[PDB]
Amino acid sequence: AWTPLEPKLITRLADTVRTKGLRSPITMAEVEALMSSPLLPHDVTNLMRVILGPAPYALWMDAWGVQLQTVIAAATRDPRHPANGQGRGERTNLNRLKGLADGMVGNPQGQAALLRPGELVAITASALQAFREVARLAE
Amino acid sequence: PWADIMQGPSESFVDFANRLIKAVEGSDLPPSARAPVIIDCFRQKSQPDIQQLIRTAPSTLTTPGEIIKYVLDRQKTA
Amino acid sequence: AWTPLEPKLITRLADTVRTKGLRSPITMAEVEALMSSPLLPHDVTNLMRVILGPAPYALWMDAWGVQLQTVIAAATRDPRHPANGQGRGERTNLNRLKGLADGMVGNPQGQAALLRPGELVAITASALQAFREVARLAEPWADIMQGPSESFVDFANRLIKAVEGSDLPPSARAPVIIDCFRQKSQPDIQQLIRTAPSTLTTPGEIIKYVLDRQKTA
Amino acid sequence: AWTPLEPKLITRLADTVRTKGLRSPITMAEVEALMSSPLLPHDVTNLMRVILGPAPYALWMDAWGVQLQTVIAAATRDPRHPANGQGRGERTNLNRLKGLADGMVGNPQGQAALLRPGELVAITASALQAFREVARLAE
Amino acid sequence: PWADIMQGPSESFVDFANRLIKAVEGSDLPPSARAPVIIDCFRQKSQPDIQQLIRTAPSTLTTPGEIIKYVLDRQKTA
Amino acid sequence: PWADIMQGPSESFVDFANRLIKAVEGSDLPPSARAPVIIDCFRQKSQPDIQQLIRTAPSTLTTPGEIIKYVLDRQKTA
Amino acid sequence: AWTPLEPKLITRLADTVRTKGLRSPITMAEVEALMSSPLLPHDVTNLMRVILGPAPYALWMDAWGVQLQTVIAAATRDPRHPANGQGRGERTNLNRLKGLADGMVGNPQGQAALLRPGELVAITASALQAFREVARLAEPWADIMQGPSESFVDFANRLIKAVEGSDLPPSARAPVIIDCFRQKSQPDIQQLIRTAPSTLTTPGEIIKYVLDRQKTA
């Protein structure tokens, strides 16, 4: 069952990003805090939509896609990925990682249903690395 | 009005990009027409130094985020 | 059946050669236009008699003979020439190419009867190359600079014209055009080409890149 | 049997390109007019040699090659191309499209002999698209 | 001291590069830290004309030799 | 009259050749006698600078077109 | 067994590079001389460290890496490389070419032990090509004219020097040298070359002809 993040925590994090900036160690610590439980693509996408401005959000979408593509290359380079399965029918496509696959587009409940925990942690680590890249790039 | 937005002589590029993306997304355009308009406004507005910086891009920039990243990398520090 | 070229087109082409000269690209385009269908030796001979003066006509007769001789050497070097046949009885002599063979002298109908289409196209290409030689002879790429006020497309047009209408081999024109774009074309465009993140290996690609990133002024 | 285009029409089209430019709608209409019947590589090549200047002609050769390469990729992606045949012996190489194949170099009669109507229409559409690209690029 | 080396207003770029590489390689840095330091000193020293020349590099330069070659190609002849 | 044609002191060579070939081909000579006459008139008319230029030809010129080409190549630009 | 190159030869070569430069034909000849026997990566690396300055050495390391990568691409494109073997266990990695593999780092004896002669000659040719690239890069032919008082052999020397020490491809130097002999080389020699009863198709032949028939003065 999907539970959304508190809008109070999200508002506090947005104001933190607004006053301290993207690169302060306190901001990265707060992001790591709100990045503790494995989030669904819907959660991370809306979180970055709210806390980041328009141009940093575009940059972050780009960087997140690139990092997820690196993850999928490593996944096709190793059939023992915690997102993959043993047979070929469990291979994870980027539509399933970005939340674009069938039964997931716009629906967080179905998303949480079909996604694997390894998928969730890989998406989360990818999003964190992308946030780091964009923060280092913006300023 | 988005089509009246120019980058001021003293304005930085991130402020201009913020203002332009705000005015384009908060307008009457369809959702599928915002990215091309933002790109073509980056190319024709954004005073001729950045215009030439975007023009002479060895790579093809096909997204507002990529254009912003490229310009922020190669901008004239001043 | 032989059909003559219109004297109206020939008169217009003659006046074009009279005003623009022999070497202008418009004149060469007009000649290529009137050189579209394969012409009989009679047609090309009368055409050059009318459009060219006496001395250029003598030069053109010389050059046409030389080019036809090169063609006949290539023909005796390959029995599969579209003018030749398989047996030795179809070998094409210069009397048949210049229209001097038996049954052809002065008669365009008999000419059109006995001539092959490969013969016609070879004669036509030979005459075109001879016209190019004489035009280059009757009236320098390494002296071309882009003027301070000249645009880049005009400079590129002038340079490509002078390089292709010169004595260089065909396989040496593209590298020369590129290296002349790089060293001529005043230092703003020189630096624009130098700082190209991609490698430009064709005059068209260089022209496209420069037209994209040029300083609008 | 090959019939050349009238030098009168070609002269009028060249003067149209000279006065109106490459991008005017009247010029594109005139080109579409002279691009009505499927032309052999010889015809289109000489036409562009006459109507275009040296630098636009170089650009057009480049663009025509690129578009023909895209066509040949689509052809190897579908064995039912009107230029292709059913067996592998009818596969169309770029030497046959650009007029560089055996029995075609410099000879328009042999060209018209060996070429297919699908080949001709594909070459013609490729040349038209290349002309559009170069016209959009020159000015 | 390598961190005090600046390209003089009248000095050429090859002399500055020679002096900088000399002072960086003949110093107390580890061997695996010389190339990044030389690059980042090319980028921040080397007076703002060459700074902007390196900044607006359509390609990514990841070696002191490549940076030197690029700058020598596109330098302002004077 | 072809035998009265001289190259004027100020006249160019292509004009003289045009005039001479015109007068020789539009005359009462047989067709097989025009080329030798045109050559021998190039050699004896065509004021002594071009006369010496044709005389000192390392190659043998046996056609009016070849003589015209040679003279146009090696003529005194003035 | 590994034998080092003489420091006397290396000192002489370093002083040659110091006085004549990187691009002089004498310097390239000396490098070819000291590049005669197949050298181990240690030898070539130390040689370039000694004879080249710091910045040319960085450029040369870059170029050598790129050329070795092209070699390894050709090697994976052909299992019959003299550096490769027949089985997959003899495939040559860049760590083995650059001397970075196991048992080779810093030790020339072990290097000479494990390396193949094909490996050595490939490394050597790669290093030579990289040296050529860097020499062409570290330091204008179309601006060269024969002065009114200059002799022809001096003009030919200067022109051939500037054309061969430039950015042209190797297959484009002879036609450019010929066409520069024809258009430069003030109009007396221009007419001397123009009126050549034979066709001159080589810079050496043109030089010989002009030296024979030149106006002694």
Add this chain to the structure above:
Amino acid sequence: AWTPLEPKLITRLADTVRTKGLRSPITMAEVEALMSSPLLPHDVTNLMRVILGPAPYALWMDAWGVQLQTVIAAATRDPRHPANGQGRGERTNLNRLKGLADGMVGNPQGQAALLRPGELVAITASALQAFREVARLAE
């Protein structure tokens, strides 16, 4: 096994040619000295590349080709050439003399492998005569 000439001797010979010229008797004596052992086409070619300037090198290539052609005419005029063999399969082509034959282009080791001693001495004498011609021609 191929052994290269010393670059020290080559440098000294190049400076001799630079100061004394091509035609001095001391220069010809030095060339005869460095022309003592039969050289492979690679050796003589690189030697003339280093000691001669560009234009004398072009002249020398021409003269060397002409002299080698005279040698090959004498060889087809006598089947007992020390470069030839008794059967027709040992006839020596100019590609083998100029080092252009198969297995020799750019490789001095293979060159030294396939070449005959008579071939080497004929190439060497031809190169010496060509050097004499070019020296008499240059000044």
Add this chain to the structure above:
Amino acid sequence: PWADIMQGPSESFVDFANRLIKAVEGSDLPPSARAPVIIDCFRQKSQPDIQQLIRTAPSTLTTPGEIIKYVLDRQKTA
């Protein structure tokens, strides 16, 4: 003495050739050394106009008769 014979400033070429061939054939030279000497005396004597005329000979002249014919053909009529 043959080695003292020069073509005078006003002397024609056939007179000079006659005098030179006379003095060379009526001398103490071997019979096999007369033609090369006559040629090399035509080339070095025979005042610099004819010297340059013989020098710029597109063909190679290997006989005194051929040199005489060539010079008589291409000589400056005066």
Add this chain to the structure above:
Amino acid sequence: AWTPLEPKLITRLADTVRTKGLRSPITMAEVEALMSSPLLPHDVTNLMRVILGPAPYALWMDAWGVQLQTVIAAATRDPRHPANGQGRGERTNLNRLKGLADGMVGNPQGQAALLRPGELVAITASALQAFREVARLAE
């Protein structure tokens, strides 16, 4: 048996050439007169040595050689030459025409012995044509 021409006739012809020149019709008539009987190479050679100066004699030697070479080309183009024979062993070499063959050098008696009448008339006609060429060339 060889009989020499009278030195009186030769002296008169030499003085005729000296006063009238080489090209006068009387001189050509006198030469035709002394060219009536077929002469041996020795006779014509000495005759031209006496009547012609040194430079015209060199020119005449050149022209005579060229004309004899044309004759020998026509002879190898037709095995029915009055100088040739039917078999290949009677083919006439230029050494036999110029009097340079074996048993003829300097000896007019042996010359007259081995030479054919067709050889003599061909040599004579060649010498007459060469004299005409040189006379037209000298003045």
